Design a binder for this molecule. Structure first.
Ligand SMILES: [Cl-]
Ligand SMILES: [Cl-]
Ligand SMILES: [Cl-]
Ligand SMILES: [Cl-]
Ligand code: NA
Ligand code: NA
Ligand code: NA
Ligand code: NA
Ligand code: NA
Ligand code: NA
Ligand code: NA
Ligand code: NA
Lengths: 127, 6
């Protein structure tokens, strides 16, 4: 019934680098989604206690959200850009597992995901 | 499961 702790966001044992694509993921991809009118359900871990969603963490075992992704980027948690992309994909997939078609949040997720995929199609040159 | 948001 209780909320789990949030996902890890900083691990000093993981190696650290800044790359063209990671910069783009934070400063273009995440920034653009974050400022979108539909971002708010996705800006923090799902607080299933406060939202009265007792089954959320019974169903969703790999939670992910843009607040966590932002902190992971800021703490150099990801080495490869595709690790970050995978976390965005996990976030969207979770939404489509937990929520039903026609639910407002699904329309929101679909719009944000289409925007995400469009921005990923302009991923910049790798080192 | 999360209700109206619009
Ligand atoms: Cl570096
Ligand atoms: Cl918002
Ligand atoms: Cl559980
Ligand atoms: Cl609902
Ligand atoms: Na890194
Ligand atoms: Na970054
Ligand atoms: Na920026
Ligand atoms: Na918007
Ligand atoms: Na969550
Ligand atoms: Na699992
Ligand atoms: Na989640
Ligand atoms: Na919908």
């Amino acid at each position: 019934s209780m909320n789990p702790p949030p996902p890890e966001t900083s691990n000093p044992n993981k190696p650290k680098r800044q790359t063209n694509q990671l910069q783009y993921l934070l400063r273009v991809v995440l920034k653009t989604l974050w400022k979108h009118q539909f971002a708010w359900p996705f800006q923090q871990p799902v607080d299933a206690v406060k939202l009265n969603l007792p089954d959320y963490y019974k169903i969703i075992k790999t939670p992910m959200d843009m607040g966590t992704i932002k902190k992971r980027l800021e703490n150099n948690y990801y080495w490869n850009a595709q690790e970050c992309i995978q976390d965005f994909n996990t976030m969207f997939t979770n939404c489509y597992i937990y929520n039903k078609p026609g639910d407002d949040i699904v329309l929101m997720a679909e719009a944000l995901e289409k925007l995400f995929l469009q921005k990923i199609n302009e991923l910049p040159t790798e080192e | 499961r999360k209700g109206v948001k619009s």
